[PDB]
Write an enzyme that holds these catalytic residues in place. Sequence first.
Site, short mmCIF file in Angstrom:
data_model
loop_
_atom_site.label_atom_id
_atom_site.label_comp_id
_atom_site.label_asym_id
_atom_site.label_seq_id
_atom_site.Cartn_x
_atom_site.Cartn_y
_atom_site.Cartn_z
N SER B 366 0.87 -1.30 0.02
CA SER B 366 -0.05 0.04 0.13
C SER B 366 0.93 1.15 -0.11
N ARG B 367 0.83 1.93 -0.97
CA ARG B 367 1.46 3.21 -1.15
C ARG B 367 1.33 4.28 0.01
#
Lengths: 62, 499, 50, 56, 470
Positions: B366-367
């Site tokens: 997840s960024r």
Amino acid sequence: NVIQDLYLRELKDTKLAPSTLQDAEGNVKPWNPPQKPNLPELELQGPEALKAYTEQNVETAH
Amino acid sequence: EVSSILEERIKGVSDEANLNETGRVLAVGDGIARVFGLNNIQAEELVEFSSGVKGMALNLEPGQVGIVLFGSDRLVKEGELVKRTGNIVDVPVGPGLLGRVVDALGNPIDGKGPIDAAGRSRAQVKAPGILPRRSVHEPVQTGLKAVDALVPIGRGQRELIIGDRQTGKTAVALDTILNQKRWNNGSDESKKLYCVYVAVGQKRSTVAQLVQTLEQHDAMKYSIIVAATASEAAPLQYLAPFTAASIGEWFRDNGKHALIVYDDLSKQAVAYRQLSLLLRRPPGREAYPGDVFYLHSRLLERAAKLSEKEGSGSLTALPVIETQGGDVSAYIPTNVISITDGQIFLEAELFYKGIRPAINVGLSVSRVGSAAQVKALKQVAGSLKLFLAQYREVAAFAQSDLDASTKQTLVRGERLTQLLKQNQYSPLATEEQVPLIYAGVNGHLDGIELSRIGEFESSFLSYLKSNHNELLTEIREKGELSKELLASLKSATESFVAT
Amino acid sequence: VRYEASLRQLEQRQLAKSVISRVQSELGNPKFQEKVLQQSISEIEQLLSK
Amino acid sequence: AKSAANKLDWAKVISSLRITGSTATQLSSFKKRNDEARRQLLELQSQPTEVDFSHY
Amino acid sequence: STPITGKVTAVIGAIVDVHFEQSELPAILNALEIKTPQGKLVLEVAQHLGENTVRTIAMDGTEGLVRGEKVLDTGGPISVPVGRETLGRIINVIGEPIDERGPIKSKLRKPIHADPPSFAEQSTSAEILETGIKVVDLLAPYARGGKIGLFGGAGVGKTVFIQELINNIAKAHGGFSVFTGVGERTREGNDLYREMKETGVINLEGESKVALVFGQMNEPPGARARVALTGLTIAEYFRDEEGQDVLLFIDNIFRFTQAGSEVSALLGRIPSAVGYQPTLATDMGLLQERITTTKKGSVTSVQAVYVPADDLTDPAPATTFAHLDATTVLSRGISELGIYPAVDPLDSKSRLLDAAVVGQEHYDVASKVQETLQTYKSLQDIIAILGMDELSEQDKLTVERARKIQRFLSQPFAVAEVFTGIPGKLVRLKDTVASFKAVLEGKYDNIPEHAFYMVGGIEDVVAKAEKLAA
């Protein structure tokens, strides 16, 4: 006007009728009774069985 | 009897005279009636027929304006009126769609409960500003231990659930809705995510399980299910994610949160393809239209976490994307992957190996991720990333016997992996996720046989509730581990490991 | 039991076709003249107001 | 009964050791057991015949 | 005024255009009939191109369509016959008997189209099908309501699979059935028709336990498309009005997909997904929703499906995989190996498999099987290179049980007496659960691999241990 007019005549002269019993019956499954159990399977009857079983197993082997 | 109810309704229908602009079909084919007239008409505005079919006006051109039909081609003929309603497609939004399964049009198709409405808002709107925004830091608990720690979830935070076909995609998603029941039960309505599941080009049979499972766990009193089914036509399917998000906007604007789970954008694309090809729109990659990107992008940029000004609310999102055996290099996956911040990638192998969920968390990133994460869970599972991470690479070494080092890593990884194998449709509280992971990290769970892991989990939990449910409640409500709780937490694991 | 359930629907369907049956009588009768004209004048009143 | 048949079959397994061939000892033992097991599950399906005119 | 006259304007294969007169006002989904020496050619209106001129699909031959020849307007879709007296007769796609015993008896008729039942009508499954085939029964069982799909390539015994299920399941259940043949060879029809006449599923008197609807591939692409809509309509009639479960069967449903693809390009609808109709999702979608369990009947279809090029990561099968509840996968290799059927153990999957629906024991046993085979397949690589004696003792034993299990999928069939010549078996659901379990628990690793080869139920497995020893 017309919706009301048409609907009054149709509603009044034609109610919800249940169908005839005869019409209903036809449209459902008929009912059939149970037919013929079965006669057990033959393997000779009479003295045809008796002579035959005795004669066939006379043999035995070492 | 019944006739009386109908009699009630009949009277409420009268002759209606006045009608506005109109057109007459010149030729109708393939759901593409082509109309003469409708000069002055809004872009994508709604039209109502004389046979009661609805349509939208994608094509405006002076010769003919090319309506696209939503319903039947059998009620539409040559030379038929097309009244111009004078209202661009908009659908009702309210609080009343809680506990309501609605079709793409917003009416109850389960036949349960009326629609309490307050406004109608357009299916397409434009995404707020830069100033209507605030950083993502609000957790959300899904009830799966792996997702919340390794690749945390947040509010107005969208990240994929992209995976293979019938590998329990729906189970990854369903667990979260069921977990949102926890906040719902209380009364702080800035923590209440009013979930929306959007079944696009997904049949009524499949959805009937979806509703049934919700009903059993008492979760049709805040879940909303917007359905454009496999049978229902391409406009309805094309407009199903736009209708669902809009319901969420009422909640979001009033200062609340709500959550939309799209299933699936692989099917949204297919419907746009059907529309493009019959209106002879430009070709693109894989024989799907070239302009698909623009469609997805408009929908996904409204899913955002707003300023405090806008009431301190968001529209959280979780798109579900269907892959053809794990292809992500495919034109429709590829578009969505860039737009959204994060992915979760389920794996076919894990499924076959009897681990269900088959979520594979190495190939999940997840960024934005851990900026939204519970403090408690960050402490006891920082370690947890580094332990599982080594074990994958050291599991490329297979059995005879190996180095003293290598064998150790497998033992630790494997107990943790069986711990993170969980039964589906079973959520977890914060107070019961946090104790278990600490047992893994501190190697009081990785000293105990694999077979006995499953047993250990419940016993340890019960043992903590009987002795000291004070520590659990403290953990939960503080949201964090303090040195006094961390002292205690080790002490407790020891007595439990002893028995 | 199935057909009994079916029958309550059929009863309404018989009233649907009945609408058609009064429709026939309207186009045969001078309702065909008088109600067409009830219809015409209302259109005159609405359209004058525009 | 049915258990007498199944005790007697094991006497017949050791009988077929002592003679040579077991050409219809086996064909007989299998038929008897088999059609005995079939009439028993057939009976579990068998209910007395009644029509419920106080429910349907 | 509606003209009863049209004159044909362009015959370009199956596509037939008509020039109707003043006032006609054409409407889609109507039926035009043209008198011809080959009967009455039915045309299903699929476009109006404007100014009273339709572009239609043919359901009968156009190798004798004369231009200038009068075209009547019939209106709506054609009407086939439904009832219970429509059983064990062979019904054509245009609704006519090719079994040649006067007309197909009626009470009521309904059209080949039907609107799909609404959400309020839908209801869940609660009954569990048991096929009697040990691999299907343990690792993916079907339930009434389901849209079963027999995915496989060619040569994996597709007809034979479909044949097996009729031999067992069809007799068993109390309901009637419908057999629908979409675009299939003149050999296969006749094979189905003789085999089941003898087995009494086809009878010359009505009120049978199957229906026959043969639509064939030497008929134009439109007919192959609407043979399916025709048979389906018989099943809806059962379900709603006459309140009886159907155990519907359709064959091969790729001929339905492939058919739509042919007339798709020509109607102007440029291909999409590469060589396929752009209306693939919705045509499927409409079809599948009709086949379901509602407030009365439960119509549980078994659909054959053909995977082209033996590759199932291609867009035409993949779209379908979603549409079907209880997939199976079959392949050339398994069939050739002697393992009947060619169903793969890990790739047979249902969305109707729950741990409670099929019971906890069953679920746990089928999971163990899925694990042991999966270890076997991971180990195949190691065994190829490293050798089989560089495996741990736990591993070596899993190889060994997995081999026993792998040959425990093999059961001969009666309708595969064209392969082995040994009649079929019936295996009860509880008997599969118990005999697989025994292998895995290590108490029934005294039994060799070949004594699980060619067996029925449990009783059989015991019987085969003795036979090989002597």
